[PDB]
Design an enzyme around this catalytic site. Structure first.
Site, short mmCIF file in Angstrom:
data_model
loop_
_atom_site.label_atom_id
_atom_site.label_comp_id
_atom_site.label_asym_id
_atom_site.label_seq_id
_atom_site.Cartn_x
_atom_site.Cartn_y
_atom_site.Cartn_z
N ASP A 61 49.97 42.83 38.03
CA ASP A 61 50.00 42.19 39.33
C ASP A 61 49.49 40.76 39.18
O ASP A 61 48.30 40.51 39.36
CB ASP A 61 49.21 43.01 40.34
CG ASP A 61 49.19 42.49 41.78
OD1 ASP A 61 49.91 41.51 42.06
OD2 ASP A 61 48.45 43.07 42.59
N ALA B 129 32.89 36.32 36.10
CA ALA B 129 33.27 35.09 36.77
C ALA B 129 32.38 34.91 37.99
O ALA B 129 32.39 35.75 38.89
CB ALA B 129 34.74 35.15 37.14
N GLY C 195 34.81 43.87 43.75
CA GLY C 195 36.09 44.06 44.41
C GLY C 195 36.48 45.54 44.47
O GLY C 195 35.61 46.41 44.57
N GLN D 176 37.04 50.95 37.60
CA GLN D 176 35.75 50.79 38.26
C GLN D 176 34.93 49.74 37.51
O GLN D 176 34.15 50.07 36.62
CB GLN D 176 34.98 52.11 38.36
CG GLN D 176 33.71 52.01 39.22
CD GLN D 176 33.02 53.34 39.44
OE1 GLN D 176 33.46 54.39 38.96
NE2 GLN D 176 31.92 53.30 40.18
N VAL D 177 35.11 48.47 37.89
CA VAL D 177 34.38 47.37 37.28
C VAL D 177 33.06 47.19 38.02
O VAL D 177 33.00 47.41 39.23
CB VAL D 177 35.20 46.06 37.24
CG1 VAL D 177 35.56 45.56 38.64
CG2 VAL D 177 34.50 44.97 36.44
N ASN E 207 44.23 38.79 41.52
CA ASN E 207 44.08 39.30 40.16
C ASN E 207 43.97 38.14 39.17
O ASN E 207 44.51 38.20 38.07
CB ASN E 207 45.22 40.25 39.82
CG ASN E 207 45.26 41.43 40.77
OD1 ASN E 207 44.32 42.22 40.81
ND2 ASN E 207 46.32 41.54 41.55
C1 LIG Z 1 43.21 45.29 43.52
C2 LIG Z 1 42.16 44.65 44.38
C3 LIG Z 1 40.96 44.12 43.63
O1 LIG Z 1 39.85 44.03 44.17
N1 LIG Z 1 41.18 43.71 42.35
C4 LIG Z 1 40.20 43.23 41.44
C5 LIG Z 1 40.54 42.37 40.40
C6 LIG Z 1 39.55 41.86 39.57
C7 LIG Z 1 38.21 42.21 39.74
C8 LIG Z 1 37.15 41.62 38.92
C9 LIG Z 1 37.06 41.53 37.51
C10 LIG Z 1 37.87 42.20 36.57
C11 LIG Z 1 38.50 42.67 35.71
C12 LIG Z 1 39.31 43.06 34.60
C13 LIG Z 1 39.49 44.46 34.26
N2 LIG Z 1 40.25 44.85 33.24
C14 LIG Z 1 40.83 43.87 32.56
C15 LIG Z 1 40.74 42.49 32.79
C16 LIG Z 1 39.95 42.08 33.85
N3 LIG Z 1 41.50 41.81 31.86
C17 LIG Z 1 42.03 42.75 31.11
N4 LIG Z 1 41.66 44.01 31.47
C18 LIG Z 1 42.07 45.26 30.85
C19 LIG Z 1 35.92 40.77 37.19
C20 LIG Z 1 35.26 40.37 36.01
N5 LIG Z 1 35.67 40.71 34.78
N6 LIG Z 1 34.16 39.60 36.12
C21 LIG Z 1 33.76 39.26 37.35
N7 LIG Z 1 34.30 39.56 38.53
C22 LIG Z 1 35.38 40.33 38.41
N8 LIG Z 1 36.15 40.81 39.45
C23 LIG Z 1 35.90 40.53 40.84
C24 LIG Z 1 37.88 42.99 40.85
C25 LIG Z 1 38.86 43.51 41.67
#
Ligand SMILES: C=CC(=O)Nc1ccc(-c2c(C#Cc3cnc4c(c3)ncn4C)c3c(N)ncnc3n2C)cc1
Length: 276
Positions: free
Chosen positions: A153, A107, A28, A34-35, A158
């Site tokens: 958010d 996920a 995303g 930057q994930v 999210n």
């Molecule tokens: C704003 C537009 C947009 O594209 N957002 C967004 C949201 C989630 C992801 C995303 C994952 C994530 C995360 C994450 C980051 N920090 C966190 C958290 C979760 N829990 C608490 N902390 C501090 C994610 C994941 N973990 N696994 C798989 N897919 C994921 N996505 C798509 C991407 C973009």
């Protein structure tokens, strides 16, 4: 520079070998950071040599001391919070002797918005499914509320869905501001609380039962507050029961107080679910 030079990186039990971790596609956009989709090997302390898909938070190109020091302080939170089923927890980390990576739960399914937008009248979402989703999140939101953490958010975008279809809430730790998910007080005073969160959950609910729909779809943002200030509330979603429509409205109660407690919602949702 970023690769720890003069910073203080303490040695944890969470740390994972940078060897087996392999970084792949990003996931995303970046409202958290930057994930990146990464593939660790042997992280379950029960399935070693067994590789696993994970998500990791590297730093950005235009990074700064702050942009780092913030991440570590976040990494610390994600440890304090504890472990819950309906939230994305810290899986591991790669702190010392190189760049800082933070490993969370991946996920397999996307964000709810796009998941719900693809399962609407081939895996047709029975209402029975819809209500489990809501319950899960609520009980996670309740957990998150216990340790006194606010959701930046709280939107379907999210929020994530595992391959096991367990609803996981991201955001408990930028870009545009989600005004349509924000409550009058929070859209005026610019300070968030659990009462504001309840609202945001109410909005989330609408977003669920509408199957990935646009809040206040048409109202210009400039006058939204005025309409809410007057009493404008979103109209009932289709195929939604009145009792669930009422609960959303209860979440959207003007005075923060009389809005439902997180527990209050969790209980109600469980009772509804028993009768499906
Ligand atoms: C704003 C537009 C947009 O594209 N957002 C967004 C949201 C989630 C992801 C995303 C994952 C994530 C995360 C994450 C980051 N920090 C966190 C958290 C979760 N829990 C608490 N902390 C501090 C994610 C994941 N973990 N696994 C798989 N897919 C994921 N996505 C798509 C991407 C973009």
């Amino acid at each position: 520079a970023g690769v720890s030079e003069y910073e203080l990186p303490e040695d944890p039990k969470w740390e994972f070998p940078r060897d087996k971790l392999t970084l792949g596609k990003p996931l995303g956009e970046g409202c958290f950071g930057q994930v990146v989709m990464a593939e660790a090997v042997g992280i379950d302390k029960d399935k070693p040599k067994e590789a696993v898909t994970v998500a990791v938070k590297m730093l950005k190109d235009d990074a700064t001391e702050k942009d780092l020091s913030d991440l570590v302080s976040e990494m610390e939170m994600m440890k304090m919070i504890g472990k819950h089923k309906n939230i994305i927890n810290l899986l591991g980390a790669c702190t010392q002797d190189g760049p800082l990576y933070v490993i969370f739960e991946y996920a397999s399914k996307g964000n709810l918005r796009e998941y719900l937008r693809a399962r609407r009248p081939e895996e047709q979402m029975t209402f029975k499914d819809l209500v489990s989703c809501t319950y899960q999140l609520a009980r996670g939101m309740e957990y998150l509320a216990s340790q006194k953490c606010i959701h930046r958010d709280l939107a379907a975008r999210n929020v994530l869905v595992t391959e096991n279809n367990v609803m996981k809430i991201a955001d408990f730790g930028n870009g545009r501001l989600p005004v349509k998910w924000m409550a009058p007080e929070a859209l005026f005073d610019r300070v968030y609380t659990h009462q504001s969160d309840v609202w945001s959950f109410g909005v989330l609910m609408w977003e669920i039962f509408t199957l990935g729909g646009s809040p206040y779809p048409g109202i210009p943002v400039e006058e939204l507050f005025k309409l809410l200030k007057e009493g404008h509330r979103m109209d009932k979603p289709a195929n939604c029961t009145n009792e669930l429509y009422m609960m959303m409205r209860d979440c959207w109660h003007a005075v923060p107080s009389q809005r439902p407690t997180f527990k209050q919602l969790v209980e109600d949702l469980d009772r509804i679910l028993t009768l499906t």
